[model samples]
Target: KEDESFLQQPHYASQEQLEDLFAGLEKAYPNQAKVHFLGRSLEGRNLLALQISRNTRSRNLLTPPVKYIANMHGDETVGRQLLVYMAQYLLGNHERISDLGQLVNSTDIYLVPTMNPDGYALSQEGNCESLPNYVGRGNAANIDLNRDFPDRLEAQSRQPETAALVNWIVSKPFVLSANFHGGAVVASYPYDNSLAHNECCEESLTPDDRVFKQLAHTYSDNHPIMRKGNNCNDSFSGGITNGAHWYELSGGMQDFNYAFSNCFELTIELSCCKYPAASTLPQEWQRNKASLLQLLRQAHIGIKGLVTDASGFPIADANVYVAGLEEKPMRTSKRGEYWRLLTPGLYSVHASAFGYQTSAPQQVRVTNDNQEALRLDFKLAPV
Candidate 1:
């Protein structure tokens, strides 16, 4: 088992400390965890991501990949600590956390504890408010990482961190993801930016509105305090809000991830205060542990399968789409595996690849009732 000393104290970690923690866990559980430096911040601090799974060190492609990025706005530190706690929690209790062993065995869980390390280093630990406080919200170059991405309405200059994250997301077949933040307690789903970029005050809903709402509530309802409602200054009924409805935001990562990439992402505001005292980190972990685990568990709650040719060789980069879903089609990984996140229902699923005939539409039923992933692989015949 990894060291539990980090959890003994409710202290937040520095960049170096965080790196050491990841390195130690990876060394201790070499078979289950891999540490990757996605890129660096403008000030040269490493942007780290921990990939934990049974196939961590291998090119195993059958398992689905999901991401949890915290501290995008550097001042929002609670989610970063919670993510650290989750990493330690999963590693320390692999055999004891019930389905965690199985979950890790079948899921590629990526944890990016701090996406804005430079800004975090400059921010105070207990301060809860303010975004324009030059030292707190923005990164080393004073750009808000959350708002640094290219928007659907118009293209913008991507920051180094934003560009790195964008490349990382596109390079993988991440089925679902959640970006953690502070300063509020609502689970916000996209599209955060509306067309025309004006104060129209309209509810901008994504094509997969039902699925996104279900995804948001999955976290809120599983959360202890978050679902209580009336926790945030802005009243979010049932502790969930549509991103644009709550407020208009352009170039937000949640919306960018959904619109540009195949990943379905949510912006989870974990606290009403941007930075809670270090002493409160333990209780914070307790409050979010269930919700975090439940959110990750959603990755395995959908339709999944391996796409292969008639001869049984896996086909890389095949298009897998569910008819009637508003989201764009998802591509298979190198191992030819694809996962479609959907609310429990019946649907027509199809798969297509270059040089191969599109597979006949397959009718399938998806559900969370069984607490297991529904498999629906496709075998395409070559032209």
Candidate 2:
């Protein structure tokens, strides 16, 4: 049984195999694992959630909690692989990787890698493969999990698992949360439904919304593995923001969780159609190792602040730019103040006004585990 090839024979797991995998994770990482019976699917399979966190000794560490939910679609199975691999790698090598050690010491991860277990099993049995091209998109009552969010449709009013997920999201106070799914290679954040249209934070936006936007952009800026931005930055890619009725996706796990509860929520689409085999897991791990490390590292860095002045007078509406990033400008406030929360790395800040010139732009280094607020006042000279 120990040498039994769970991978070789069809490569898909039944309900029994899925539970065994969960049990294995729990047993292997007892220190960092906790399980909850969130609810059951319409087909009467248990909806499981794994809370992975490690005890650590660090000051002001509130456990920068982040969530990664997967298998929301029964047919989309590769995301489940990525999710499980992430959990295992973190637990198995927390000591070998210094950053993982630090991250574990300060953060808690919530993973719902297989949200639609029953449907997944059905797909495997019906399609002869665990990761089916299309099957089990709905629950036993025949409802799509993605479309069935919190809304009550006659077809998919509500499932026990959805209720459990909703409750979990409503209560937890996390810095970031991502609902993983397959299809499309880009990292899709916010406004999952195309019906609603919301851009990034701006005029009349709340502080929490602004902060979330900043954090989202920071995630994109910190890692080159993928590009992220607000809805409609370019015509090519656009999605919804937290607020706005177009995005008024009532009961959407992330939408409801972040909009009203003040948590930073994101919707992440893992892949377009790359069905990576189980053997490819190791190689994908290598490709993603750096990004994984850097993402965990980002929770520790904060933003910097400055006041721009032209000829000793505060200059309003000065164009502020961070080099190698978007060419678009970040204009100063009426008080000539500007602030940016960035991930740990090197950055150059440029401030230019209508009648003034900048002095070689200020460059700064952001270090790990440092939280001291940085201040740089730029005084501009007449052009």
Candidate 3:
């Protein structure tokens, strides 16, 4: 493990280096760490996604899936670097760190160091004030990777990166997600655009706005500087903002995650500088480290359950709906597993799938005192 000392010093790993580092990780820790390509980037660079969990080589069931994707904007360098550090830290210390042990044991964590490797290749490391498309903010097609996702109101041409990541997202039951970005500092939550689609699109609250706020705050409140709502030379409320209110974009990825899939995502703006100097990576990691783990803990904050048929087989893609908090109902995984994130409260939850009778409403109490998610499984009868 000592030979893997490249991460000890603060530095940015380019695409080739990133791939090598992950390959080294899987070789060193074969059981707890695994790496696979989601798909190829625009320039044929492998879009690497690292999955770390107990027995990662095998399927982990009854455990919810959570993910972090960075370098969506290729110039935003810190997030991907921070993710590399996180992967090493988790793999290197899980056996010794009880919290990390519980994390790996109970949650399937996915980390994408760079989704836009082609753009990342084109971005300058130290230049600060250039917003040129040629500077590699977007992918090879000159499309903003964040804005290329399918919008609720308007149709857009899907970029290859968008199609790849979107397919990866919808295929799994991702309970909570955070996409890393730079050029600002705030924890931004769902509905990044508006139904009205006006110029001044602000405060387009989701049905789960309260829960989303808490989810965002969970990150902001833990980040060292972000908690103060002062970063990248701007001010925010408790370091969190509604994405649309902050600024509206029609096809932002965070909105796509919640509206179209079963994930609650936060856009975490880590630094003001889009691509700060490599020397600053250590400080950046320290600032965001606690927030990262704390946000993972949020995966268990609300409710967890398995929905199955009366015949004892696991139900795939069964929709789980929580009354009074239905923005987009969560879909169960192949193992009949679902995790519903919520603030502490009492609520009625139900599950339904095609051609089967919906399960009876189950009154569930969501509390903070519990360390693990409260379990509530359902046995649905046939129609």
Q: Pick the candidate with the highest TM-score.
A: 3
Candidate 2 lDDT over 1-383, as tens digits, reads: 12212334334445676667778878877767766677788778888776777741221323455577777777666667666667666776777777667677766777777888766665542222334334565566656666555432112347766777777765544545666554433343444332323443322233343344544444444434335333222211232233332233334565544444424455554444434445654544444445445544444444334445544556666766767643435455455644443555777877777877765777887554553335566778878
Residues 196-228, candidate 3: write the lDDT tens digits: 665543688888888889888989998878899
Better of 2 and 3 by lDDT: 3
Q: Tell me the alpha-carbon RMSD of every candidate.
A: 2.2, 11.8, 2.1
Query: Model 1, 328: alpha-carbon shift in Å?
Result: 2.1
Counting clashing residue pairs in each candidate, in order, gives 0, 7, 0
User: Between candidates 2 and 3, which one is better according to TM-score?
Assistant: 3
Tell me the TM-score of each prediction against the true structure: 0.94, 0.61, 0.95
Q: Note the Cα lDDT for every prediction shown.
A: 0.84, 0.55, 0.84
lDDT per residue for candidate 1 within 85-143, as digits (tens), equals 88888887876656788778777899999999988988987788855555668888887
